[PDB]
């Protein structure tokens, strides 16, 4: 182990989704149907089964029913398979043009075309299944977030800078889109207000920092990935790895506190200040609870599963 895991701030206990096993079998079968499994040159069945993204989605989205959980699970399986496939067929072979054309072809499967690869097929099926359940606004926003996350893999060619950039280019807003699918979508009235932006900011920072704390083994040391919270703080402040871990954890705790504060106090305040109807207020609250649940279940999935892989 690179460092001893710091003391985590965990105000809300993680809850597990009762439909888990169903999501596991369905995600495996679906991943096979997309051609992401053996024969792809990227994943085998054992790899996907070892990753266990079904547990991640069941932990992060406890209140959604079985099929929705299955959909979210297929989304996560797809994006992780996207990362691996891009780091295999393109990044490894160092072909920029092919990957660029790929990243150009991907948004075409999310209209607001015939797949040449398992990624495009998966994205197509996922869009087909997901779209009827959400509005046009969510479609646009989630398409934008998705395209952001995908185009962030184009990189082949300072702590505050790192956190702020990862805030925009991370996978947290994407996951939050899937969250507002899991519970309720955020009304356009309070969508642009400061408390919601701070909500998204703190959430993103927290998730990303935690992920950095748990990925230091397989990314910094083993892979050689230069982007990590712990690594950045370590090189910047000249601190030892453990000290950097403790600092990142402290910042994480602070972001969680600001998260809770703005969520359970300021957000309903700006919800009432914008004259939002109670029906939409319930949606905002459900969204907040969805974020909290996602954080909790995420940490729990990291602790109980991923760190042993």
From Swiss-Prot:
Belongs to the terpene synthase family. A motif (DDXXD motif 1) lies at residues 83-88. The earthy odorant geosmin is also responsible for the 'off-flavor' of contaminated drinking water, wines, and other foodstuffs. It comes from Streptomyces coelicolor (strain ATCC BAA-471 / A3(2) / M145). This is Germacradienol/geosmin synthase. Tow-domain protein where the N-terminal domain catalyzes the cyclization of farnesyl diphosphate (FPP) to a 85:15 mixture of the sesquiterpene alcohol germacradienol and the sesquiterpene hydrocarbon germacrene D. The C-terminal domain partially converts the germacradienol formed into geosmin, the characteristic odoriferous ('earthy aroma') constituent of Streptomyces species. Consists of 2 homologous sesquiterpene synthase domains. The Asp-Asp-Xaa-Xaa-Asp/Glu (DDXXD/E) motif is important for the catalytic activity, presumably through binding to Mg(2+). The chain holds residues 4 to 327 of 726 of the full protein. Residues 1-309 are annotated as: Germacradienol/germacrene D synthase. The gene is cyc2. Mg(2+) binds at residues 83, 88, 249, 253, 258.
């Amino acid at each position: 182990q690179p460092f001893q895991l710091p003391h985590f701030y965990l105000p809300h206990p993680a809850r597990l989704n009762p439909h888990l096993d169903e999501a596991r079998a369905h995600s495996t079968t679906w991943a096979r149907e997309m051609g992401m499994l053996e024969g792809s040159g990227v994943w085998e069945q054992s790899d996907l089964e070892a990753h266990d993204y079904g547990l991640l989605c069941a932990y992060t989205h406890p209140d959604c029913d079985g099929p929705a959980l299955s959909l979210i699970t297929d989304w996560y399986v797809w994006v992780f398979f996207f990362d691996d496939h891009f780091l295999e067929k393109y990044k490894r072979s160092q072909d920029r043009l092919a990957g660029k054309a790929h990243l150009d072809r991907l948004p075409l499967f999310m209209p607001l075309p015939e797949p040449r690869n398992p990624v495009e097929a998966g994205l197509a099926d996922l869009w087909t299944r997901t779209v009827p359940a959400m509005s046009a606004d969510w479609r646009r926003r989630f398409a934008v977030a998705t395209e952001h996350l995908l185009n962030e893999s184009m990189w082949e060619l300072n702590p505050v800078e790192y956190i702020e950039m990862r805030r925009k280019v991370g996978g947290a807003p994407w996951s939050a889109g899937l969250v507002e699918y899991a519970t309720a979508e955020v009304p356009a009235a309070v969508a642009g207000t400061r408390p919601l932006r701070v909500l998204m900011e703190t959430f993103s920072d927290a998730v990303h920092l935690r992920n950095d704390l748990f990925s230091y083994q397989r990314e910094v040391e083993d892979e050689g990935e230069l982007s990590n919270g712990v690594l950045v703080l370590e090189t910047f402040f000249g601190c030892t790895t453990q000290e950097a871990a403790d600092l990142v954890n402290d910042v994480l705790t602070s972001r969680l506190h600001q998260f809770e504060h703005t969520a359970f106090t300021e957000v309903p305040a700006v919800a009432l200040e914008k004259g939002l109807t109670p029906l939409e207020v319930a949606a905002v609250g459900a969204y907040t609870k969805g974020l909290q649940d996602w954080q909790s279940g995420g940490h729990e999935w990291h602790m109980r599963s991923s760190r042993y892989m």
